[PDB]
Amino acid sequence: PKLVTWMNNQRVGELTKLANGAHTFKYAPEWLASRYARPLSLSLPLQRGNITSDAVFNFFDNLLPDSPIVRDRIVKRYHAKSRQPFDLLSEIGRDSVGAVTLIPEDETVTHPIMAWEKLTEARLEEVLTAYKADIPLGMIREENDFRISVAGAQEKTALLRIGNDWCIPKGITPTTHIIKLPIGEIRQPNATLDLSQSVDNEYYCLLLAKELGLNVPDAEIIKAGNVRALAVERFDRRWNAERTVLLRLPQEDMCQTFGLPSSVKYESDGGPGIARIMAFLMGSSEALKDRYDFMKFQVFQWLIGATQGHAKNFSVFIQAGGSYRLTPFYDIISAFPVLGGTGIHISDLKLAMGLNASKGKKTAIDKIYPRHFLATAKVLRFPEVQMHEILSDFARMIPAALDNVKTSLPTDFPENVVTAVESNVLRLHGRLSREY
Numbered sequence: 189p190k191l192v193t194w195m196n197n198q199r200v201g202e203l204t205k206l207a208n209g210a211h212t213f214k215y216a217p218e219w220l221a222s223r224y225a226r227p228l229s230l231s232l233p234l235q236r237g238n239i240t241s242d243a244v245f246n247f248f249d250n251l252l253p254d255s256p257i258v259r260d261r262i263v264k265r266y267h268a269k270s271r272q273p274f275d276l277l278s279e280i281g282r283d284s285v286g287a288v289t290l291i292p293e294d295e296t297v298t299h300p301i302m303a304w305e306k307l308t309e310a311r312l313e314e315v316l317t318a319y320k321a322d323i324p325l326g327m328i329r330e331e332n333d334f335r336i337s338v339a340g341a342q343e344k345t346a347l348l349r350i351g352n353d354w355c356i357p358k359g360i361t362p363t364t365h366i367i368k369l370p371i372g373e374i375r376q377p378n379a380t381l382d383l384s385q386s387v388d389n390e391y392y393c394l395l396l397a398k399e400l401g402l403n404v405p406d407a408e409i410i411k412a413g414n415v416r417a418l419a420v421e422r423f424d425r426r427w428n429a430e431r432t433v434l435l436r437l438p439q440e441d442m443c444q445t446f447g448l449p450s451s452v453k454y455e456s457d458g459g460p461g462i463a464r465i466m467a468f469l470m471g472s473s474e475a476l477k478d479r480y481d482f483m484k485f486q487v488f489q490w491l492i493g494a495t496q497g498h499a500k501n502f503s504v505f506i507q508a509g510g511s512y513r514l515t516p517f518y519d520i521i522s523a524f525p526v527l528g529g530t531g532i533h534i535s536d537l538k539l540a541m542g543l544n545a546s547k548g549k550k551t552a553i554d555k556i557y558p559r560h561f562l563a564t565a566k567v568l569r570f571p572e573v574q575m576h577e578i579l580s581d582f583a584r585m586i587p588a589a590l591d592n593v594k595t596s597l598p599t600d601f602p603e604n605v606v607t608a609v610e611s612n613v614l615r616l617h618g619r620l621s622r623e624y
């Protein structure tokens with residue numbers, strides 16, 4: 189029972205579901221014997237023979253949705269053999285996050301390689317409201333070519349845009365976007381989250397992120413009838429130098445990077461933090477810069493209060509030769525517009541990975557001061573003279589950032605989201621001015 193694994197169009201090896209349920213992968217000699225070859229994941233480097241590591245399982249399990257519901261659907265959708273990472277992927281394992289492609293050992297490929305199917309304005313709304321039909325990742329039933337897969341827990345979908353048209357890829361056509369819908373859970377301790385308007389909030393956050401010289405993905409708000417969904421330009425997808433072929437970008441996150449399961453994704457649950465990930469960024473290609481933009485992303489998160497910035501929300505492109513480097517900062521949301529007399533106080537918002545405090549780690553966003561950010565870099569051998577610069581710029585830039593954004597907002601954008609965010613971002617920013 190195999191599952192041929194390709195990377196773009198070259199063969200890497202084959203995943204196989206054992207007779208007891210275990211998962212084993214083995215790199216094809218063709219892939220192994222090539223000066224320009226890279227591993228499936230930094231949790232399983234190139235090697236001859238079979239591989240059994242709990243890693244060869246976790247890797248693929250992270251390649252599936254983080255929501256029971258979604259997986260509850262993925263099954264009934266295509267009648268999966270089971271709920272294990274394999275049998276599920278056998279179904280929608282085609283276009284997934286990164287450049288990995290899983291094809292059933294026996295149903296071999298014919299048909300034009302890269303084929304899709306344009307979508308009518310009135311049909312797109314379907315793909316966007318597929319949950320109403322009990323469908324996973326928005327994959328219309330009529331067809332059957334739809335076999336995408338995406339991580340996360342939010343009701344989303346991924347499509348292929350050609351020129352000025354929304355197309356549902358076919359066979360193994362790489363999707364170019366990730367249209368996420370305003371439904372699902374978020375985090376903090378013991379408590380999940382329902383906030384403002386997913387799209388607006390996220391959008392806003394990305395706008396500030398970008399306006400704040402922060403590297404994030406290209407995304408715009410869209411509307412298919414009465415469906416306000418957000419579509420982000422996948423940063424693991426790229427066309428040939430002249431738009432001839434649409435290639436993928438081998439990528440993986442920080443949970444697979446360490447061979448860790450999906451469960452242990454939250455530091456509080458035994459996951460990695462600013463210390464385990466940084467100590468790992470010292471081996472990154474552009475390590476000097478990757479270590480910098482990271483730390484800076486912490487302040488930003490602390491400033492816009494992003495309580496769901498766990499280990500599964502950070503990745504690294506797998507560069508040829510097994511080398512790696514940090515990717516853009518995807519998935520950005522503020523918990524500020526959820527505060528107030530809604531029984532949730534700012535003293536309750538905690539961060540995913542804590543900072544070097546006086547005693548262990550400090551998370552409550554309502555308690556983190558400059559000293560905590562420095563003590564963090566101090567401990568992690570991150571030049572202090574470089575952190576002060578970060579806390580600095582923020583003190584001088586944020587005030588204007590929250591403004592330049594207000595002027596570049598949609599018409600129908602919740603005037604109140606901005607209110608609950610720019611107020612808190614400003615209260616926190618204050619702790620900065622008072623030092624820098």
Ligand SMILES: Nc1ncnc2c1ncn2[C@@H]1O[C@H](COP(=O)(O)OP(=O)(O)CP(=O)(O)O)[C@@H](O)[C@H]1O
Nearest residue numbers: 285339340341342405420421422423424500518519
């Ligand atoms: N613009 C982009 N380009 C490439 N990959 C992206 C991306 N945006 C998100 N991803 C990838 O897809 C995964 C899930 O997307 P996202 O983080 O937006 O989901 P969610 O918002 O569904 C997550 P959760 O609710 O579980 O915190 C990420 O872990 C990342 O690997």
